[PDB]
Each structure stands twice: as C-alpha cells, then as structure tokens.
UniProtKB/Swiss-Prot annotation:
Disulfide bonds join 4-22, 8-18. Expressed by the venom gland. One of its GO terms (molecular function) is toxin activity. Belongs to the short scorpion toxin superfamily. Potassium channel inhibitor family. Gamma-KTx 2 subfamily. The keyword Secreted applies. This is Potassium channel toxin kappa-KTx 2.9. GO terms for cellular component: extracellular region. It is found in: Secreted. The keyword Cell inner membrane does not apply. Reversibly blocks voltage-gated potassium channels Kv1.2/KCNA2 and Kv1.3/KCNA3. It comes from Pandinus imperator. Contains 2 disulfide bonds.
Length: 28
C-alpha cells in the first residue's frame, strides 16, 4: 500500500524524507 515509499527507499536513505516525499502525490 506504500509503493511510493518502497520506491523512494531504494534511492534514498532517509525514511522521513521519503514519507514527506510521498506526502503529497499531487503536484501543486
């Protein structure tokens, strides 16, 4: 259910950054 997080976790080494990265899926 957290594909974006799992994706980010493969290029990033910061979980909280990935959470905030996948926080808003719609580009403002």
């Amino acid at each position: 259910v957290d594909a974006c997080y799992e994706a980010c976790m493969h290029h990033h080494m910061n979980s909280d950054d990935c959470i905030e990265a996948c926080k808003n899926p719609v580009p403002p």
